[PDB]
mmCIF file of C-alpha atoms in Angstrom:
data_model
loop_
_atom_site.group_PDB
_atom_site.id
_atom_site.type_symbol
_atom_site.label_atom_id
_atom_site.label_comp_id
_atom_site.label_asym_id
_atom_site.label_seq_id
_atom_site.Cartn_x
_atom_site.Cartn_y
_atom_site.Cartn_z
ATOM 1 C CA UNK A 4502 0.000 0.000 0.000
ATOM 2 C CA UNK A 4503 2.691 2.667 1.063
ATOM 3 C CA UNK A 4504 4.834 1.683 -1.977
ATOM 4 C CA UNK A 4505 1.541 1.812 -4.380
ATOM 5 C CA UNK A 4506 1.038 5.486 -2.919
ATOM 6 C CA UNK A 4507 4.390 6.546 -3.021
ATOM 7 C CA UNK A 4508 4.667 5.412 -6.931
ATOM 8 C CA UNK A 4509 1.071 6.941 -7.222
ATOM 9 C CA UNK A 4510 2.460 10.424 -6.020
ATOM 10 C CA UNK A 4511 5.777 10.510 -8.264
ATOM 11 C CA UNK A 4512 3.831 9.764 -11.045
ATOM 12 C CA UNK A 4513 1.292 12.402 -10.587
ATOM 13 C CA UNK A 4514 4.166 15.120 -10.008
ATOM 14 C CA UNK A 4515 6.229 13.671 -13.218
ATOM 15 C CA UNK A 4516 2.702 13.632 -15.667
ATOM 16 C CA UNK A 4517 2.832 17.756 -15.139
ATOM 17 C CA UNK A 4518 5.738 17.834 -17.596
ATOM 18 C CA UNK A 4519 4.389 18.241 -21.469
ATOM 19 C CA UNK A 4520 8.148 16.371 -22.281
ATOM 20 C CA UNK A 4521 6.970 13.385 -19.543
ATOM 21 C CA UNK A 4522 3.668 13.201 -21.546
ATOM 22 C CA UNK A 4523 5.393 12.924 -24.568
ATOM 23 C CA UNK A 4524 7.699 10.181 -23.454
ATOM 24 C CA UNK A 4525 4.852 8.320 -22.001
ATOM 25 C CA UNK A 4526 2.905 8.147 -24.852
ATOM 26 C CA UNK A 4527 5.461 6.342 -26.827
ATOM 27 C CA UNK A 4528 4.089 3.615 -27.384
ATOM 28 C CA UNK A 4529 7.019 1.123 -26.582
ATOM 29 C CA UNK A 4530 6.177 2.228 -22.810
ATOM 30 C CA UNK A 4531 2.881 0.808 -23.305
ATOM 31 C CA UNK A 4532 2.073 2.761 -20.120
ATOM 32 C CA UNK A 4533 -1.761 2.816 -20.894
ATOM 33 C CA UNK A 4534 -1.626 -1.183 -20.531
ATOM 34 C CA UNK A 4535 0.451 -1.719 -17.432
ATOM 35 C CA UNK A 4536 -2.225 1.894 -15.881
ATOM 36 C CA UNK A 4537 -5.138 -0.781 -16.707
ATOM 37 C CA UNK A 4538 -3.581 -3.429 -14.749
ATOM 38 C CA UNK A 4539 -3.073 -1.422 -12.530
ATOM 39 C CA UNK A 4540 -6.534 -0.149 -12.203
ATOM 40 C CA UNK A 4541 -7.786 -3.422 -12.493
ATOM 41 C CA UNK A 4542 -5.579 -4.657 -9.400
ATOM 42 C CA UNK A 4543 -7.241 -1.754 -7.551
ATOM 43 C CA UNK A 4544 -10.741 -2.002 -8.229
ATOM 44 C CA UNK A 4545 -10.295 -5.658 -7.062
ATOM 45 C CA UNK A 4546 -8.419 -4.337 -4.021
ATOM 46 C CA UNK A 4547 -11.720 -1.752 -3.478
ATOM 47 C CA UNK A 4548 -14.783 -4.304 -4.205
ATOM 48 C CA UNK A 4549 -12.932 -7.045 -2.271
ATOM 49 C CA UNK A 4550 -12.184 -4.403 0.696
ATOM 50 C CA UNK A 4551 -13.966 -1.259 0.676
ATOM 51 C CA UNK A 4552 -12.224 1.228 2.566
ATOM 52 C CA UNK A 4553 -8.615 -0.355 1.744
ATOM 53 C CA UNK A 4554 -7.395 2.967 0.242
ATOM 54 C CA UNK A 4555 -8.066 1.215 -3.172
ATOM 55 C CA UNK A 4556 -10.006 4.478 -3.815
ATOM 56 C CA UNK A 4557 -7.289 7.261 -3.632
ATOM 57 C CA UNK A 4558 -5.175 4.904 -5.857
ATOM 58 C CA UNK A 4559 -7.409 4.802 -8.381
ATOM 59 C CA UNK A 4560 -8.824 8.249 -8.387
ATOM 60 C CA UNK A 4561 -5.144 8.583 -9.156
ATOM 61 C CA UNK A 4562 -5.039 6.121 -11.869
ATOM 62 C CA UNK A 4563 -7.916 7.918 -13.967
ATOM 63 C CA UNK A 4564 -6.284 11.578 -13.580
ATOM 64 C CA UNK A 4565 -3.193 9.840 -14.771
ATOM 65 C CA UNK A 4566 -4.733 8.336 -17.793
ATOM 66 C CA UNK A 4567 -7.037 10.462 -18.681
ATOM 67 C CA UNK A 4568 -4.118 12.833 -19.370
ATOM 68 C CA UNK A 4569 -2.113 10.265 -21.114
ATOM 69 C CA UNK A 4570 -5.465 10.216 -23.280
ATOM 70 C CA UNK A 4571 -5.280 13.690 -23.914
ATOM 71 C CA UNK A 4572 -2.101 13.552 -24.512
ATOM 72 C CA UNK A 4573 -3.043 10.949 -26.997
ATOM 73 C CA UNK A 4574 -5.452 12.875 -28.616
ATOM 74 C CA UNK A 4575 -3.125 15.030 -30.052
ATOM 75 C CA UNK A 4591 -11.674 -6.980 -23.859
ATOM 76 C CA UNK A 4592 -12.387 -10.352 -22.038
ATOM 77 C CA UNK A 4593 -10.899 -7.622 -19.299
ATOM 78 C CA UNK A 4594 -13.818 -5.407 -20.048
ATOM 79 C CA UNK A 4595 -16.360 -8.302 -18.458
ATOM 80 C CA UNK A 4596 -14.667 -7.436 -15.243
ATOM 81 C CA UNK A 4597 -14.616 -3.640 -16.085
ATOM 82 C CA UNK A 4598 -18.405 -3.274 -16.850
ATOM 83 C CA UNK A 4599 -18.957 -5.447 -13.473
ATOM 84 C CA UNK A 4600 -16.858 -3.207 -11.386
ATOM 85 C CA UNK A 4601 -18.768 -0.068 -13.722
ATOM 86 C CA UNK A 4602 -21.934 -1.529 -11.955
ATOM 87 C CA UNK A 4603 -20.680 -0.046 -8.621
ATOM 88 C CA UNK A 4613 -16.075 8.820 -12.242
ATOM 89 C CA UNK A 4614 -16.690 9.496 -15.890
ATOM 90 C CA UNK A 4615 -13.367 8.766 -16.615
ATOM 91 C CA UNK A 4616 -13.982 5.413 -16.168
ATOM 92 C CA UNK A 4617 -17.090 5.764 -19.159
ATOM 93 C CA UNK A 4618 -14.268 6.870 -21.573
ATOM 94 C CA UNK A 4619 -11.582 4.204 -20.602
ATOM 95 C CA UNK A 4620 -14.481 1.412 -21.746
ATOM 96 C CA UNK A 4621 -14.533 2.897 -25.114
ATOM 97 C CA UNK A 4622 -10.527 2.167 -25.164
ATOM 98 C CA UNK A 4623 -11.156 -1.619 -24.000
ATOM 99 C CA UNK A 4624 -13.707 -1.910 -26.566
ATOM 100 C CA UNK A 4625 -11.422 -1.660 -29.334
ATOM 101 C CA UNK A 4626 -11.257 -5.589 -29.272
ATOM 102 C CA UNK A 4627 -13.852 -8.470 -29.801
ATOM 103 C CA UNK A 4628 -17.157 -6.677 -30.989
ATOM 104 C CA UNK A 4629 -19.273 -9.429 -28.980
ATOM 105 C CA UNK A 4630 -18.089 -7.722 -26.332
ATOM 106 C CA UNK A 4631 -19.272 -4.433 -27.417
ATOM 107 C CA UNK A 4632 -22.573 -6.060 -27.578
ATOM 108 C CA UNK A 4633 -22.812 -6.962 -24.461
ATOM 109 C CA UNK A 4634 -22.092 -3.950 -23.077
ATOM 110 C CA UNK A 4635 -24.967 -2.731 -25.507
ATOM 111 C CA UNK A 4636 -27.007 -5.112 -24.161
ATOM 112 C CA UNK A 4637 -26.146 -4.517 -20.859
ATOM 113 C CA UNK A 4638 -27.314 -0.857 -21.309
ATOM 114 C CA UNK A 4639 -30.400 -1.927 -23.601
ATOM 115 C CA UNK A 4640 -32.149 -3.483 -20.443
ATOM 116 C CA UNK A 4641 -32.360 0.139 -19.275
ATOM 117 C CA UNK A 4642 -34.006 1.385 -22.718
ATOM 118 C CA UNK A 4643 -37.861 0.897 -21.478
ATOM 119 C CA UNK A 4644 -38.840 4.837 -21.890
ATOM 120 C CA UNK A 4645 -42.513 4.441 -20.270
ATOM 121 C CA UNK A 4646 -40.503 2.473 -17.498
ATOM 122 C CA UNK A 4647 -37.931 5.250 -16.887
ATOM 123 C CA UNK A 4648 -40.505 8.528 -17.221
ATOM 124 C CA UNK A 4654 -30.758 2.605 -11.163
ATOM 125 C CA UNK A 4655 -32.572 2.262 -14.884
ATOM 126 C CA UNK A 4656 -32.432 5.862 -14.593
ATOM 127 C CA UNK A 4657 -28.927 5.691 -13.400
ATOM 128 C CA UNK A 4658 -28.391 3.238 -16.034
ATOM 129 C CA UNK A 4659 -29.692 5.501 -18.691
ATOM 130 C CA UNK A 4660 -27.904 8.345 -17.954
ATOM 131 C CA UNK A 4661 -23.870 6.467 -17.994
ATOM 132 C CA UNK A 4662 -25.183 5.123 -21.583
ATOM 133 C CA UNK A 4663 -26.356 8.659 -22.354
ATOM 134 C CA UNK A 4664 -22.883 9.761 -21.503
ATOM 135 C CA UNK A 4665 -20.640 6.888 -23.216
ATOM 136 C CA UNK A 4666 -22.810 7.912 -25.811
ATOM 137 C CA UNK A 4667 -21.185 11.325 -26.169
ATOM 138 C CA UNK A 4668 -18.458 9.386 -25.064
ATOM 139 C CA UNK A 4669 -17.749 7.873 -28.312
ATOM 140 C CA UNK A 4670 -14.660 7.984 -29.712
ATOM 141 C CA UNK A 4671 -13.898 8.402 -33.396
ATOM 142 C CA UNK A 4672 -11.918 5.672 -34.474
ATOM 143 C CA UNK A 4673 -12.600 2.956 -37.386
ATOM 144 C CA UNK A 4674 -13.929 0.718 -33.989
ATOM 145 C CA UNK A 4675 -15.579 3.347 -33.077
ATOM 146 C CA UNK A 4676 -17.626 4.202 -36.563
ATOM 147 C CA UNK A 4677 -18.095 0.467 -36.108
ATOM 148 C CA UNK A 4678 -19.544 -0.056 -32.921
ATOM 149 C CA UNK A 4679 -21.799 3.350 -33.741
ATOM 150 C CA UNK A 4680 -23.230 1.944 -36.854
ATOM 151 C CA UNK A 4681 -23.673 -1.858 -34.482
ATOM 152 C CA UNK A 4682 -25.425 0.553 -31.843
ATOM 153 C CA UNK A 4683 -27.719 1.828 -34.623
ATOM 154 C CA UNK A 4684 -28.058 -1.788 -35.651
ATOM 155 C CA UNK A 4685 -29.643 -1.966 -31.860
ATOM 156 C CA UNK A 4686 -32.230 0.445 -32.667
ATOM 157 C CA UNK A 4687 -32.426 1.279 -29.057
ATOM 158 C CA UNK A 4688 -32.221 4.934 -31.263
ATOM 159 C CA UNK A 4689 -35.550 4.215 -33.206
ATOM 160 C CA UNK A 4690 -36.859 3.322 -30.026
ATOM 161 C CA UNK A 4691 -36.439 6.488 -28.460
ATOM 162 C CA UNK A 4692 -37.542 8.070 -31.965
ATOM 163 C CA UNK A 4693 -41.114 6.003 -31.558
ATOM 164 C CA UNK A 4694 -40.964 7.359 -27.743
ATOM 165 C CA UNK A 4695 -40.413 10.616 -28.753
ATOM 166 C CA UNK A 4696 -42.735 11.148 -31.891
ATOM 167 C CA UNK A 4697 -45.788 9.197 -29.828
ATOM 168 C CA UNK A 4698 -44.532 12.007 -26.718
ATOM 169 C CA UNK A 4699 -44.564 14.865 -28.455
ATOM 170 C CA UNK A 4700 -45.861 17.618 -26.562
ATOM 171 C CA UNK A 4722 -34.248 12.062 -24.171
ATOM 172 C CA UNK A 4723 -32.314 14.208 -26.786
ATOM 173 C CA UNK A 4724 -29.154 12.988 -24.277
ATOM 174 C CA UNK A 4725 -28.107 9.924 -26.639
ATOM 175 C CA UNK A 4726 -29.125 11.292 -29.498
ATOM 176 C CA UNK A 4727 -26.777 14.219 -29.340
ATOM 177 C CA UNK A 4728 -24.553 11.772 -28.091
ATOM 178 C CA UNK A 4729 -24.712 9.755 -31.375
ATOM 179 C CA UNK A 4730 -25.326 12.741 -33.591
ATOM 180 C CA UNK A 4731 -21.464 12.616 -34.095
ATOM 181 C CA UNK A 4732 -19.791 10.968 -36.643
ATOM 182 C CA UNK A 4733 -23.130 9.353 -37.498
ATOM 183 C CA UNK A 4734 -23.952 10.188 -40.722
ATOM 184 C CA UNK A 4735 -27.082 7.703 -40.923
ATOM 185 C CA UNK A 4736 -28.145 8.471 -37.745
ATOM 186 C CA UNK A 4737 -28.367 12.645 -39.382
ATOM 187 C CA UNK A 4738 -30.265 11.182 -41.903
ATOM 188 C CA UNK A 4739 -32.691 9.691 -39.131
ATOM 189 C CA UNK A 4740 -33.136 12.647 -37.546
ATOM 190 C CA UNK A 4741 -33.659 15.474 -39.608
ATOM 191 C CA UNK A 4742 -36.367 13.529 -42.000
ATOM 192 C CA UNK A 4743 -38.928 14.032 -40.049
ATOM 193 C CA UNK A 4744 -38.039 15.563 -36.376
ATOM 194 C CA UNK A 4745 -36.870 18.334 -37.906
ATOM 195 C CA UNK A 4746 -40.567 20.209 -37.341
ATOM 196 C CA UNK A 4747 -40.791 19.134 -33.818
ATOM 197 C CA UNK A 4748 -37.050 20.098 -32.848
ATOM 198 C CA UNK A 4749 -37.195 23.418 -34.451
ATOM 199 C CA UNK A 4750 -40.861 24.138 -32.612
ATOM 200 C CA UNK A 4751 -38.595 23.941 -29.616
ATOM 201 C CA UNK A 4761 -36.175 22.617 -24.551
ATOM 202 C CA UNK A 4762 -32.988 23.638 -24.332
ATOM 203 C CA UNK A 4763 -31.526 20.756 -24.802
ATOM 204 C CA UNK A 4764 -33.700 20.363 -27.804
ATOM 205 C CA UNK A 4765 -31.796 23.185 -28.766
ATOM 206 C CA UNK A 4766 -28.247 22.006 -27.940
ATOM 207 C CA UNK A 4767 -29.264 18.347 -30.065
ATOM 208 C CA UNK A 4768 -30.350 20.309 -33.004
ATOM 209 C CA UNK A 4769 -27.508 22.193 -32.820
ATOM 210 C CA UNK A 4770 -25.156 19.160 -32.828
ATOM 211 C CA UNK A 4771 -27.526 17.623 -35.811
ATOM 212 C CA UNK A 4772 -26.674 20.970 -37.567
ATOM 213 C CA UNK A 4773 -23.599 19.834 -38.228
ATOM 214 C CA UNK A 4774 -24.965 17.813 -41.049
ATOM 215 C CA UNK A 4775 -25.500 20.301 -44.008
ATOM 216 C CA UNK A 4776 -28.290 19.125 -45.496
ATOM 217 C CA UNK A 4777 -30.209 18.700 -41.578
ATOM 218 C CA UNK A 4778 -28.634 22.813 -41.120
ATOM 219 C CA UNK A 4779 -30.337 23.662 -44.645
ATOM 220 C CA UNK A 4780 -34.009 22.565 -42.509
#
């Protein structure tokens, strides 16, 4: 434990350099592995003990990759990740990293959210609802990523929310969310919710906004 925080704090003083960032993310370190490990040893520590300073360690383990991700920017392990997800954010944009692997396991993590998709139920599923609202604008945009967007529209957990929505009209979460990199999912939108969104609900707004993006749904 004392060793694990000690390590803990020199890294966290060493990440502050731009040059350590760089040297990090080369990837012949293959830091970002060894930091899941890492993070996997310490959720195990935390679930198996609450209270055994697991916590701090991996508070410490997010801040630390989440800035080698930035840093970046310029899954049979992901059973155990979702499970320990069950019991912040940071940890909804790691998955999308571990997801670039087997896409049945992308599916089960769609699954896994799709239990939560009853909309007369919802207006813990909320809970549920609102982490998949958020890996939703948590998706990255990679080639797996375009992937496991166009398998997520395969779901149609989207036109699901579209039927909610059109028999509603008087939620716009995942679809402004999805309304990146999602060509198709434009398409979807603007054909016909483009009345209803522009009667409009600030967040109604904010999703037509991101829609807007798309020429043909800013030319409505």
């Amino acid at each position: 434990r004392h060793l694990l925080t000690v390590l803990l704090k020199l890294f966290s003083y060493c990440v502050k350099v731009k040059v350590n960032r760089q040297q990090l993310v080369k990837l012949e370190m293959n830091t970002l592995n060894v930091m899941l490990g890492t993070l996997n040893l310490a959720l195990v520590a935390e679930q198996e003990s609450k209270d055994s300073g697991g916590a701090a360690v991996a508070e410490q383990v997010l801040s630390i990759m989440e800035i080698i991700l930035d840093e970046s920017n310029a899954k049979d392990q992901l059973v155990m990740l979702l499970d320990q997800i069950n019991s912040l954010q940071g940890l909804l944009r790691i998955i999308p990293y571990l997801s670039f692997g087997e896409v049945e396991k992308m599916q089960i993590l769609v699954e896994r959210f799709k239990p939560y998709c009853n909309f007369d139920k919802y207006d813990d599923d909320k809970v549920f609802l609102d982490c998949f609202c958020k890996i939703a604008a948590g998706i990255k945009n990679n080639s797996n990523g375009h992937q496991l967007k166009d398998l997520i529209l395969q779901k149609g957990i989207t036109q699901n929310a579209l039927d909610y929505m059109k028999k509603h009209i008087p939620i716009l979460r995942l679809l402004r969310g999805l309304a990146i990199q999602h060509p198709g999912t434009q398409v979807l939108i603007g054909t016909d919710s483009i009345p209803n969104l522009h009667k409009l609900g600030t967040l109604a707004e904010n999703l037509l906004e991101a829609l807007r993006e798309h020429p043909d749904v800013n030319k409505k």
